[PDB]
Amino acid sequence: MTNIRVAIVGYGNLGRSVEKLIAKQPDMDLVGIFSRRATLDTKTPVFDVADVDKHADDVDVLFLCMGSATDIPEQAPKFAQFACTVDTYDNHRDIPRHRQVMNEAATAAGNVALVSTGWDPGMFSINRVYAAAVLAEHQQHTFWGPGLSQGHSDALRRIPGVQKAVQYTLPSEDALEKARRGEAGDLTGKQTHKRQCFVVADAADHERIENDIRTMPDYFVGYEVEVNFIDEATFDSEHTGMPHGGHVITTGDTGGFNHTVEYILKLDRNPDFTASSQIAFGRAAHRMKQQGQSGAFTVLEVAPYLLSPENLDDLIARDV
Amino acid sequence: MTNIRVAIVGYGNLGRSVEKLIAKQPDMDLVGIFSRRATLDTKTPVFDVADVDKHADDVDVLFLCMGSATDIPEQAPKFAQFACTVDTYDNHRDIPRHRQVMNEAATAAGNVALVSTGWDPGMFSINRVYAAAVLAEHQQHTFWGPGLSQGHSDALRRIPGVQKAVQYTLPSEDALEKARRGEAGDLTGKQTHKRQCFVVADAADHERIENDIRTMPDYFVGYEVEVNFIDEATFDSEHTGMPHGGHVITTGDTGGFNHTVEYILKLDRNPDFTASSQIAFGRAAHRMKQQGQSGAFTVLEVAPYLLSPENLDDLIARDV
Numbered sequence: 001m002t003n004i005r006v007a008i009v010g011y012g013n014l015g016r017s018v019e020k021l022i023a024k025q026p027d028m029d030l031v032g033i034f035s036r037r038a039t040l041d042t043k044t045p046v047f048d049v050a051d052v053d054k055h056a057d058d059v060d061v062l063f064l065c066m067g068s069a070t071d072i073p074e075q076a077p078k079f080a081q082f083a084c085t086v087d088t089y090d091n092h093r094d095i096p097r098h099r100q101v102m103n104e105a106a107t108a109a110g111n112v113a114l115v116s117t118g119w120d121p122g123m124f125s126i127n128r129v130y131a132a133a134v135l136a137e138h139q140q141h142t143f144w145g146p147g148l149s150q151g152h153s154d155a156l157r158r159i160p161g162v163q164k165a166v167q168y169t170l171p172s173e174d175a176l177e178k179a180r181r182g183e184a185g186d187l188t189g190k191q192t193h194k195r196q197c198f199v200v201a202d203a204a205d206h207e208r209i210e211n212d213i214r215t216m217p218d219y220f221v222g223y224e225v226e227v228n229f230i231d232e233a234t235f236d237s238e239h240t241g242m243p244h245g246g247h248v249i250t251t252g253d254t255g256g257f258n259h260t261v262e263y264i265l266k267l268d269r270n271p272d273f274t275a276s277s278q279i280a281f282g283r284a285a286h287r288m289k290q291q292g293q294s295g296a297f298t299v300l301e302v303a304p305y306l307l308s309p310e311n312l313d314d315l316i317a318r319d320v
Numbered sequence: 321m322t323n324i325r326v327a328i329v330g331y332g333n334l335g336r337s338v339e340k341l342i343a344k345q346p347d348m349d350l351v352g353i354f355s356r357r358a359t360l361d362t363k364t365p366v367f368d369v370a371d372v373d374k375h376a377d378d379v380d381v382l383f384l385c386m387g388s389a390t391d392i393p394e395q396a397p398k399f400a401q402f403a404c405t406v407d408t409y410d411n412h413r414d415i416p417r418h419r420q421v422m423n424e425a426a427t428a429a430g431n432v433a434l435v436s437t438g439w440d441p442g443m444f445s446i447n448r449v450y451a452a453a454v455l456a457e458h459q460q461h462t463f464w465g466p467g468l469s470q471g472h473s474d475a476l477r478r479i480p481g482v483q484k485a486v487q488y489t490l491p492s493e494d495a496l497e498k499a500r501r502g503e504a505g506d507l508t509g510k511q512t513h514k515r516q517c518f519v520v521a522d523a524a525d526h527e528r529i530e531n532d533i534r535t536m537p538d539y540f541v542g543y544e545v546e547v548n549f550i551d552e553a554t555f556d557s558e559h560t561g562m563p564h565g566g567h568v569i570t571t572g573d574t575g576g577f578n579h580t581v582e583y584i585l586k587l588d589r590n591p592d593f594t595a596s597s598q599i600a601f602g603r604a605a606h607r608m609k610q611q612g613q614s615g616a617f618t619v620l621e622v623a624p625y626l627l628s629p630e631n632l633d634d635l636i637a638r639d640v
């Protein structure tokens with residue numbers, strides 16, 4: 001049948017969310033997990049990542065769930081040569097480059113590669129584009145949280161001396177309300193979000209770790225940053241959740257008439273929504289290839305019906 | 321240059337909104353208005369609709385701004401044979417049929433036809449699809465207003481004896497809040513919207529007109545309907561606006577974790593946002609055809625980047 005044979009590459013939080021979610025897909029079959037490790041805390045079969053070539057015939061889509069600001073750039077293209085790949089690559093400054101290289105790779109193999117999926121990048125990206133396209137004269141703002149930013153949390157974890165750490169992005173409600181009225185055109189994303197950190201570290205390292213957090217380009221400089229050092233027991237019991245979300249707000253004027261477009265996401269578990277998007281886009285990638293296409297593609301180049309497990313005609317008869 | 325020669329067919333509220341808005345498009349040129357009437361309250365050149373064939377060489381896209389529940393079904397296909405057409409056909413039960421016929425017509429002429437655009441159908445349709453696709457187990461509700469429904473207002477105007485009339489769709493805020501919590505799964509759209517009518521008519525016709533409103537299939541039966549008869553002076557001074565909007569709310573569970581997706585529109589002028597969408601989709605239709613495609617297409621089959629006046633690479637470098 002047209003049941004999409006799928007495999008996951010890597011096995012952290014995201015890989016784990018994708019695994020449990022692939023089960024609720026009516027047209028997908030998890031064939032296994034490709035890992036560097038021989039044993040893994042799962043019932044799902046595991047193969048050495050180095051034996052992908054041997055499985056390149058039993059797997060339709062390769063969900064790249066390993067990487068962050070490292071393993072995806074270096075490793076992602078190698079996988080494009082064996083199957084259709086879907087990644088959630090979120091380094092915004094590098095997305096254009098990452099897509100150029102993935103493209104050469106995918107087109108060269110005759111398979112499709114969907115890059116930088118998720119909710120941001122991903123769902124928020126699509127929303128920014130549609131609203132800005134439809135409203136000729138517009139103002140647009142993207143707000144995150146309140147909630148745990150995965151990108152900022154692991155940036156904190158890479159700082160020598162940091163044992164455990166979490167980062168909460170907190171948006172200004174005033175800014176939020178002003179953006180809805182079209183009164184936030186003089187404000188940028190750095191002025192409308194406070195970044196709150198909770199870090200476990202030896203007291204001897206506090207001064208150094210704090211300066212390192214505050215002067216970290218891209219992630220923290222330019223932002224109002226709060227740094228909280230707590231003992232490990234407090235970290236462990238009070239910071240267990242992973243909620244997140246945000247708003248993409250666009251306003252536009254059509255001649256003395258204001259229009260407000262707002263997309264909102266309230267997620268109880270951050271990696272679970274990222275995996276859900278990554279999955280629907282893997283269904284699209286196969287459809288795109290199965291219908292003859294190749295190379296890299298951003299979420300901006302996929303027609304919405306390609307993500308739906310449903311027949312196009314049912315969608316037009318029920319959803320339009 | 322690649323400045324899209326465009327023309328408008330018809331000239332009511334929508335045609336009028338499209339005209340003023342085409343001016344703020346950086347890549348479009350209004351060539352004229354095709355009308356049944358010789359004279360029109362505009363500076364824009366007007367041609368007899370019957371002379372479209374003579375202009376089929378000077379016009380790239382034909383914005384169909386005439387029709388509603390009549391002129392579009394009968395007339396829309398004739399125009400597909402002369403240029404790319406964009407319509408805002410909103411008869412939900414007939415959209416699938418309307419697209420089948422438009423398709424034969426467009427494919428037969430080698431040009432593209434974008435059907436049923438606007439905000440609903442249109443923007444709300446896209447949102448229903450994405451959220452339902454990404455969230456495997458989901459609940460979805462569409463709320464309208466508060467505001468003036470154009471479809472229901474002109475349905476009222478067709479009732480013999482009705483001189484003037486307006487209809488306001490009012491959604492239940494309780495339902496709204498319950499949908500955000502995932503507690504509205506037992507409710508339908510008929511139970512969550514009250515339909516409020518303001519009608520001018522001779523007092524002799526009130527009883528008959530009211531029964532006709534209440535028993536009108538599709539538009540009013542099944543809904544809680546309020547009918548208000550007012551004098552014309554009151555109608556004229558107090559019911560001049562055309563605001564509208566709504567929410568598409570989807571919830572989903574990923575294993576004990578809830579996710580809420582909400583798309584909201586607050587429009588100060590209803591036809592102005594419909595025209596803004598219709599316009600961006602006319603830019604896409606040309607791109608689709610200019611890149612070799614033909615037949616009818618719903619908003620579900622257009623990749624988002626096709627609506628943006630901007631270069632794809634700028635979008636990926638700035639918006640992803």
Ligand SMILES: N[C@H](CCC[C@H](N)C(=O)O)C(=O)O
Binds near residue numbers: 090144148150244
């Ligand atoms: N930059 C955003 C987060 C985006 C979402 C996802 N990419 C993540 O890292 O959680 C924030 O500051 O909270």
Ligand SMILES: N[C@H](CCC[C@H](N)C(=O)O)C(=O)O
Binds near residue numbers: 410468472489564590
């Ligand atoms: N059925 C919706 C309206 C959709 C929007 C647009 N199609 C219009 O007629 O205004 C309502 O009841 O208010």
